[PDB]
Paper text:
During the first 3 years of the pandemic, the spike (S) protein on the virus surface has been actively undergoing antigenic drift generating a large number of variants. Being a highly dynamic protein, SARS-CoV-2 S-protein has been observed to adopt RBD “up” and “down” conformations. Our structural study reveals that interactions between the VL6-57-encoded mAbs and RBD are mainly mediated by germline gene encoded residues in HCDR3 and LCDR1, while germline gene encoded LCDR3 residues support HCDR3 in antigen binding. We provide evidence to suggest that the identified class of antibodies constitute a potential immune pressure driving the genesis of S371L/F-S373P-S375F mutations in Omicron variants.
In binding competition assays, we found that all the 5 mAbs compete with ACE2 and with each other to bind RBD. These results suggest that all the 5 mAbs target overlapping epitopes. Among CDR loops, HCDR3 dominates the contact with RBD, the hydrophobic HCDR3 loop, containing residues L101, G102, P103 and W104, probes into a hydrophobic cavity formed by RBD residues Y369, A372, F374, F377 and P384. This hydrophobic contact is further stabilized by surrounding electrostatic and polar interactions, distributed in two different patches: the larger interaction patch is mediated by hydrogen bonds between backbone of RBD residues S375, F377 and LCDR1 residue N32 sidechain; a cation-π interaction between RBD residue K378 and LCDR1 residue Y33; a charged hydrogen bond between RBD residue T385 and LCDR2 residue E51; and finally a salt bridge between RBD residue K378 and LCDR2 residue D52. The second interaction patch is mediated by a hydrogen bond between the glycan attached to RBD residue N343 and HCDR2 residue K52; and a hydrogen bond between RBD residue N370 and HCDR2 residue Q53. Finally, RBD residue A372 is contacted by LCDR3 residue Y94.
Residue numbers in the entry:
A (entry chain L): 1 to 110, 118 to 221
B (entry chain A): 14 to 70, 76 to 617, 641 to 676, 689 to 699
C (entry chain H): 1 to 221
């Protein structure tokens, strides 16, 4: 059960030296060679560190590695931290006739700071409900950063099943937009009091209320 | 500010031929009646030069951002003064210093800064309704600049803003260079009555300015002026006119030129040295008139193509098999020591397998092992349980690391470990294996002990019998078939490599490329890096020799080691480029003669003669060649070669 | 400089058999170790299988043990991977990995790869719902219009309004994956509310795998 433990978001820093630690638990990683793999997002991966102390030809000398047997961890150090570092890194080992890979450590961050999110509702019409369907869509747009949570509130109890949300997409306004879909039945639509779809952001919460009375 | 253009139908660029164009003064000195040769960047004669159009009658507007090489040639046959100026730079994004040279209607300025350039700088000319004159108002060249170093204003050249569709009446040439950060501009206005296919006339370009800027230039763009009359709606989307204009862009490359000077020090004619054999003969003699006779201009040498290597055969496989495939393994306190030497090392089967669990190599890197030759190779072997495998590495401490086997801190070897539980243990377990638990002190590296005395722990001696405060340092190991993975037996073999003053006896495998013969190739047969052909010989060698020399003491016969063939070494070819000339005021063509190189084309006794037709009849000869064969110009009429008549 | 070309994917099958190929050039195929590595879209790297330079020894992970097979040959310089009894987890991008000395030196070689996805939905008729918000106040994201496309497979859908006559203000939200792995998306355009009855709004939806083109008029409730 050999595995490697390493973080997922580190080195978000401009222009200095930062170390990344990858460690194992089942056995000593210093017995065999451990290598670091470095991958373009959306393209083919490459390798920055091999043999645990050297680098391939053409790789800049900014990257370096070290081994600490006291803490049973492997350290990868990047010195330059230039503009060519937007990658996720992995640590790979070899226990016995098998290969084990790391989780992945994403490194990407090397006029108005706040935008009001415009939120809209589209309740199902008579055409939707006459075909034994009920699609409620929760739309959110113009938010920064794109880290939001969409929730649905019923008359007396929050729902858990039937709600799907997509990742935000980059539009032509230097902002992001996200959508949420809910599949429901007409029986609970007319047996409730007021429907609510709430969205949470960094120190912001916008809630909207509609009624089945049309 | 700037605007973007719309897609339309354009014309592809065409290619024209230069005719004695691109010659300027290479220095600021005076030479009178002097044929002086200098090394500088010019435009070669009869070279391919890139051509662009600018005539409206359609809608041709092509100004790409062409790369700036070492020196450019810009010739414009401007008539209606449609061209305005040039810009330079590297990225054109307000990050590096960039040039702005514009010949405006009032004055000429040279500003180098970080101007924010759009995708197509241009100047806009409007026709006024009340005023019957063309004036420029749209000064859309850049947005802004932050800071810069150099600025210059030239003379106020008068500019005509009226565009027509007639034939050209003036020709303007410009040369831009950048040596040691110094900007060089050469220009000269030359009137002509022509529209296309620039004449064969000669006109040297005088220097104009020597602006010190000291930046990098790799891209440049051209600025053009359009007109907005009452016919066009006035919008720069689909309706516009640009008159009739044309400009040529050429790139300079370094060549050697022979320049002729007159009594007032003006350049009249130029002769190249790498264009024509006649031109080479003219420029080597430092004269514009060549008489009849033999002449030597340069030499000719063939170059090697490939590089073959054939190391001798390797078959001395090291005894790595039985040291790894050993039925019996010694105890840890009595670890075996085997010396391996005088064999060709083969680690290829060692790393290609995967039955082993540890392949760490301290000191030296295992990625290059076949290219390393060592003097002595040692190999130890002992069995240890899976827990005490990390204790083998130097630096760590433990029971095995300090009482049974200690490694030095400067180890340059490798450690091989693998698991063998079924072979080393039966159903009842193995109890034949001994290890040390107690010692008087620590153990020095590469030291083993065999004594099985009674370990003393307290102060009172036990008189050499079993009792309290003194026990057996040597103890047995218990093994189980169903125990843990860490308690299973593991076999560990440690490799040690050392260098001494003795010659190296252990070497890695070598490679051998295929043998190519009868071609000018390069070979390295363990004693020389010789380049030449490898012919098949007819002389046998005694069965102890690898080399071979001649009377002149030159290695020209080396035996191939892997099939035992005797191959000769011969230099590829060399010689000189001789030329025969009919003379002055008689002909213009020459014929190339090689002194001893073996190949319209006639195979003469005195080498290879090309460009001269051999004829069987014999006349009296005038230009000697050699071996009873001369050359002459005889009836049109061409250069002939024949046997001379006594 | 070593070329690696992979072309073995591009189709969906539940529990079937698939054949992936990696082509290599620029080196000697019969002297270095070989491997295969896959990664999930949006997840980390994981190892799949490895094979010796002569094909004598092959190993896989315990998740794919029992199934899967790998074979090689040195005459035509190609690597063969065959899969059987696929599951829903097998949506991954497969790279053919090349070694130098053994399993300790490193992967260090990742062919560009081929996108491989598996799904059970072959082709179903899309559902069109041009929602008409007759009653809606101002100061909102959408004044009054709505179009919804639901229950279609696979991507993509050509969404047009008024046969492509209008193109300003059209915003099409990306498709979302439901609990059954089904795509759904909506497109909104900002138009004045005074033209609800004075202008005809038709939502055009075209699906190329389903060869269906449905134009539906928008009528306020
Ligand atoms: C110990 O014996 C085994 C068994 O033959 C050797 O393993 C073979 O290695 C050769 C190398 O030429 C391969 O061609 C065979 O395929 C291998 N056979 C098996 C069954 O493993 C091994 O090389 C020997 N150990 C040493 C160090 O010589
Ligand atoms: C110039 O180049 C073009 C194509 O690159 C070729 O067709 C043409 O013959 C060249 N001109 C000369 C004088 O060689
Ligand atoms: C002509 O153009 C130059 C280039 O910047 C400018 O400095 C000059 O002011 C212009 N002339 C007039 C009269 O505007
Ligand atoms: C500003 O001018 C100085 C010269 O005084 C120059 O070294 C510097 O590079 C300029 N600034 C920029 C951003 O180029
Ligand atoms: C100019 O460019 C050359 C080659 O690109 C480079 O060697 C040199 O350092 C550059 N100099 C400056 C001042 O940018
Ligand atoms: C150049 O020299 C020639 C030879 O005497 C003479 O005829 C001519 O006038 C001179 N030209 C000038 C510009 O001095
Ligand atoms: C060199 O070795 C090969 C096998 O490794 C053998 O076939 C060949 O005959 C040898 N060459 C000699 C003995 O000249
Ligand atoms: C010159 O070369 C040709 C072909 O390579 C050959 O037939 C001829 O014999 C050679 N001449 C001499 C004098 O060796
Ligand atoms: C010259 O004449 C002789 C007469 O026999 C003939 O054999 C030979 O081929 C001729 N040579 C040429 C080049 O015509």
């Amino acid at each position: 059960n050999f595995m490697l433990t390493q973080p997922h978001s580190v080195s978000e820093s401009p222009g200095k030296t930062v170390t990344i630690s990858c460690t194992g638990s089942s056995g000593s990683i210093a017995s065999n060679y451990v290598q670091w793999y470095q991958q373009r997002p959306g393209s083919a991966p490459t390798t920055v560190i091999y043999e645990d102390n050297q680098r391939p030809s053409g790789v800049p000398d900014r990257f370096s590695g070290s081994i600490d047997s006291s803490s049973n961890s492997a350290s990868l150090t990047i010195s330059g931290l230039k503009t060519e570092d937007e990658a996720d890194y992995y640590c790979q080992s070899y226990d016995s006739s098998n290969w084990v890979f790391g989780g992945g450590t994403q490194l990407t961050v090397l006029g108005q700071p706040k935008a009001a999110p415009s939120v809209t509702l589209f309740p199902p019409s008579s055409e939707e409900l006459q075909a034994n369907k009920a699609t409620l869509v929760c739309l959110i747009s113009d938010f920064y950063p794109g880290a939001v949570t969409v929730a649905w509130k019923a008359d007396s109890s929050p729902v858990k099943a039937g709600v799907e949300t997509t990742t935000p997409s980059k539009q032509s306004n230097n902002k992001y937009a996200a959508s949420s879909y809910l599949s429901l039945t007409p029986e609970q639509w007319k047996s409730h009091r007021s429907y609510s779809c709430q969205v949470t952001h960094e120190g912001s919460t916008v809630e909207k209320t509609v009624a089945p009375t049309e | 500010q700037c605007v973007n253009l719309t897609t339309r139908t354009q014309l592809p660029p065409a290619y024209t031929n230069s005719f004695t164009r691109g010659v300027y003064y290479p220095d600021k000195v005076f030479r009178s009646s002097v044929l002086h040769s200098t090394q500088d960047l010019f435009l070669p004669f009869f070279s391919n030069v890139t051509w662009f159009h600018a005539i409206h009658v359609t809608k041709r507007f092509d100004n790409p951002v062409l790369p700036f090489n070492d020196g450019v040639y810009f010739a414009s046959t401007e008539k209606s003064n449609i061209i305005r100026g040039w810009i330079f730079g590297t990225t054109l994004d307000s990050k590096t210093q960039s040039l702005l040279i514009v010949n405006n209607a009032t004055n000429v300025v040279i500003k180098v800064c970080e101007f924010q350039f759009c995708n197509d700088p241009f100047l806009g000319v409007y026709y006024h309704k009340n005023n019957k004159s063309w004036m420029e108002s749209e000064f859309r060249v850049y947005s802004s600049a932050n800071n810069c170093t150099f600025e210059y204003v030239s003379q106020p050249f008068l500019m005509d803003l009226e565009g027509k569709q007639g034939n050209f009446k003036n020709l303007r040439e410009f040369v831009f260079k950048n040596i040691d950060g110094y900007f060089k501009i050469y220009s000269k206005h030359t009137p002509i009555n022509l529209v296309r296919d620039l004449p064969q006339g000669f006109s040297a370009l005088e220097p104009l300015v020597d602006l010190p800027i000291g930046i990098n230039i790799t891209r440049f763009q051209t600025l053009l002026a359009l007109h907005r009359s009452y016919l066009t709606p006035g919008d720069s989307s689909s309706g516009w006119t640009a008159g009739a204009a044309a400009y040529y862009v050429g790139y300079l490359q370094p060549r050697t030129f022979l320049l002729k000077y007159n009594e007032n020090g003006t350049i009249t004619d130029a002769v190249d040295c790498a264009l024509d054999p006649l031109s080479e003969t003219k420029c080597t003699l430092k004269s514009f008139t060549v008489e009849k006779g033999i002449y030597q201009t340069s030499n000719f040498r063939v170059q090697p193509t490939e590089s073959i290597v054939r190391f001798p055969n390797i078959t001395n496989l090291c005894p790595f098999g039985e040291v790894f495939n050993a039925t019996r393994f010694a105890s840890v306190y009595a670890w075996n020591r085997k010396r391996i030497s005088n064999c060709v090392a083969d680690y290829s089967v060692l790393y290609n397998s995967a039955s082993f669990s540890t392949f760490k190599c301290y000191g030296v890197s295992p990625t290059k092992l076949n290219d390393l030759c060592f003097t002595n190779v040692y190999a130890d072997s002992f069995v240890i349980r899976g827990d005490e495998v990390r204790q083998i590495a130097p630096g760590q401490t433990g029971k095995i690391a300090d009482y049974n086997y200690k490694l030095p801190d400067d180890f340059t070897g490798c450690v091989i470990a693998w698991n063998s539980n079924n072979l080393d243990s039966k159903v009842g377990g193995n109890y034949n294996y001994l290890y040390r638990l107690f010692r008087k002190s620590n153990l020095k590296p590469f030291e083993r002990d065999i004594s099985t005395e009674i370990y003393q722990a307290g102060s009172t001696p036990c008189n050499g019998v079993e009792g309290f405060n003194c026990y057996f340092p040597l103890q047995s190991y218990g093994f189980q078939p169903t125990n843990g993975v860490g308690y299973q037996p593991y076999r560990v073999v440690v490799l040690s490599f050392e260098l001494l003053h003795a010659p190296a006896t252990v070497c890695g495998p070598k490679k051998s490329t295929n043998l190519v013969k009868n071609k000018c190739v390069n070979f390295n047969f363990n004693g020389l890096t010789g380049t030449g052909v490898l012919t098949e010989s007819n002389k046998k060698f005694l069965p102890f020799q690898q080399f071979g020399r001649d009377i002149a003491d030159t290695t020209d016969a080396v035996r191939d080691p892997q099939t035992l063939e005797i191959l000769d070494i011969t230099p590829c070819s060399f010689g000189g480029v001789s030329v025969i000339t009919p003379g002055t005021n008689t002909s213009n063509q020459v014929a190339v003669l090689y002194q001893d190189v073996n190949c319209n084309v006639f195979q003469t006794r005195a080498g290879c003669l090309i460009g001269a037709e051999h004829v069987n009849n014999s006349y009296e000869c005038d230009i000697p060649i050699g071996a009873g064969i001369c050359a002459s110009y005889q009836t049109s009429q061409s250069i002939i070669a024949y046997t001379m008549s006594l | 400089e070593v070329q690696l070309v992979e072309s073995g994917g591009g189709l969906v099958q539940p529990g079937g058999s698939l054949r992936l190929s990696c082509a290599a050039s620029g080196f000697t195929f019969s002297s270095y170790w070989m491997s295969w590595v896959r990664q999930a879209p949006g997840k980390g790297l994981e190892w799949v299988a490895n094979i010796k330079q002569d094909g004598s020894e092959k190993y896989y992970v315990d998740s794919v043990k029992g199934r899967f097979t790998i074979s090689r040959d040195n005459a035509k310089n190609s690597l063969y991977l065959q899969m059987n009894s696929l599951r829903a987890e097998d949506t991954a991008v497969y790279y053919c990995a090349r070694g130098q000395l053994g399993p300790w030196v490193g992967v260090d070689y990742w062919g560009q790869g081929t996108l491989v996805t598996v799904s059970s939905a072959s082709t179903k008729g899309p559902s069109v719902f041009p929602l008409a918000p007759s009653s809606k106040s101002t100061s909102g994201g959408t004044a009054a219009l709505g179009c919804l496309v639901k229950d279609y497979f696979p991507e993509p859908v050509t969404v047009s309004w008024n046969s492509g006559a209008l193109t300003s203000g059209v915003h099409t939200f990306p498709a979302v994956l439901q609990s059954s792995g089904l795509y759904s998306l909506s497109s909104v355009v900002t138009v004045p509310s005074s033209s609800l009855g004075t202008q005809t709004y038709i939502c055009n939806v075209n699906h190329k795998p389903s060869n269906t083109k449905v134009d539906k008029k928008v009528e306020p409730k």
